[PDB]
Amino acid sequence: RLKELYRKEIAPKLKEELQLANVMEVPRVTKITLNMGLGEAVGDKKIIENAVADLEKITGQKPVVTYARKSIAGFKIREGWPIGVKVTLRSDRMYEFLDRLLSISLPRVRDFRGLNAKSFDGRGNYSMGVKEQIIFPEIDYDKIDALRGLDITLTTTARTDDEGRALLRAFKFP
Amino acid sequence: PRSLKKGPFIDLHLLKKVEVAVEKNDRKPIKTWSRRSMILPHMVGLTIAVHNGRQHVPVLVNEDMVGHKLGEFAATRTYR
Amino acid sequence: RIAGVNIPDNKHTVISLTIYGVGRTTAQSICAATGVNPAAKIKDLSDEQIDQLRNEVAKITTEGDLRREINMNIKRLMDLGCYRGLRHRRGLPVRGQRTKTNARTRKGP
Amino acid sequence: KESMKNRELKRQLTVAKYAKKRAELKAIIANPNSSAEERWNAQVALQKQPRDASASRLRNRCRLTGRPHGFYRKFGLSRNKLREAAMRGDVPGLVKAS
RNA sequence: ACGGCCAGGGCUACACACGUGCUACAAUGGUCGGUACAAAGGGUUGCCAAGCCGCGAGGUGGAGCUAAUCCCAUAAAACCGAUCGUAGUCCGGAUCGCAGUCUGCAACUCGACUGCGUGAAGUCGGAAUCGCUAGUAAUCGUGAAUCAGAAUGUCACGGU
Neighbouring-strand partners of residue B42:
none
DSSP A95-160: HHHHTTSSSS---SS--S---TTS---SS---------SS-SSS--SSSS------------SSSS
Other chains touching C, judged by 3 or more CB pairs under 8 Å? A, B
User: Minimal CA–CA distance to D26: which of D51, D54, D59, D50?
Assistant: D54
* Distance of alpha carbon C18 from alpha carbon C13, whole angstroms: 8
Calculate how close chain A gets to C100, using CA atoms only, in Å: 36
For A66, the 3-state DSSP assignment is strand
The answer to whether the beta carbon of residue C45 comes closer than 7 angstroms to any atom of strand E is no
- Please check whether residue A140 is in contact with residue A69, taking contact to mean a CB–CB distance below 8 angstroms: no
Question: Which nucleotide in the DNA or RNA is closest to residue B5, CA to C1'?
Answer: E102
Amino acid type, A97: F
Q: What is the DSSP letter of A62?
A: P
Question: What's the full length of chain D, in residues?
Answer: 98
Nearest to D47 among B7, B8, B13 (CB): B13
Interface of B with C (CB under 8 A): 58, 60, 71-73, 75-76, 79
Question: Which nucleotide in the DNA or RNA is closest to residue B60, CA to C1'?
Answer: E109
| Architecture per CATH, C1-68 | Orthogonal Bundle (1.10)
A and D touch with 3+ CB pairs <8 Å, answer: no
| Domain of B11, in residue numbers | 1-80
**Domain boundaries defined on chain C:** 1-68, 69-109
Calculate how close chain D gets to B50, using CA atoms only, in Å: 22
Q: What is the DSSP letter of A83?
A: E
Q: What domains are defined for chain D?
A: 1-89 (1.10.287.1480)
To one decimal place, what's the resolution in Å? Answer: 2.9
Strand E, CB < 7 A, residues 17-36 of C = 17-28
Nearest to C68 among A110, A141, A142 (CB): A110
* Distance of alpha carbon A99 from alpha carbon A2, whole angstroms: 11
The answer to whether the beta carbon of residue D49 comes closer than 7 angstroms to any atom of strand E is yes
Contact between D40 and B10 using a beta-carbon 8 Å cutoff: yes
Other Cβ atoms closer than 10 A to A85: 22
Calculate how close chain B gets to C102, using CA atoms only, in Å: 19
Contact between C81 and B79 using a beta-carbon 8 Å cutoff: no
Residue B74 CA and nucleotide E92 C1' are separated, in Å, by 36
CA angle B39, B28, B35 (to 5 degrees): 40
* Distance of alpha carbon A82 from alpha carbon A80, whole angstroms: 6
Torsion of CA A69, A71, A75, A78, to 10 degrees: 100
| Architecture per CATH, C69-109 | Irregular (4.10)
The distance of Cα B71 from the centroid of its chain, to the nearest Å, equals 10
Calculate how close chain D gets to B13, using CA atoms only, in Å: 6
CATH number, domain of B54, equals 3.30.860.10
The phi, psi pair for B28, rounded to 5°, reads -130, 145
- Those of residues 79-98 in C touching chain A at CB distance below 8 A are none
Give me the number of domains chain B comprises.
1
CA angle C92, B68, B48 (to 5 degrees): 105
Question: Which nucleotide in the DNA or RNA is closest to residue C67, CA to C1'?
Answer: E96
Report chain B's terminal Cα–Cα distance, integer Å: 32
Protein-covered nucleotides of chain E (CB closer than 7 Å) are 3-4, 6-16, 18, 30-33, 45, 55-56, 59-60, 82-84, 87, 89-113, 115-121, 145-146, 148
Q: Dihedral of CA C33/C38/C43/C44: which sign?
A: negative
Neighbouring-strand partners of residue A85:
A65
Nearest to D39 among B10, B12, B13 (CB): B10
Residue B29 CA and nucleotide E94 C1' are separated, in Å, by 39
* Distance of alpha carbon D59 from alpha carbon D68, whole angstroms: 7
Contacts of D31 in chain B (CB under 8 A): none
Q: Dihedral of CA C66/C68/C70/C72: which sign?
A: negative
Residue D33 CA and nucleotide E70 C1' are separated, in Å, by 29
List C-alpha distances in Å: A114 to A128, A165, A173.
6, 15, 10
Contact between B73 and C81 using a beta-carbon 8 Å cutoff: yes
* Distance of alpha carbon D33 from alpha carbon A78, whole angstroms: 82
Cβ-Cβ contacts under 8 Å for B64 (sequence gap 6 or more): none
- Provide the pairing of β-strand A82-86 with A64-67: antiparallel
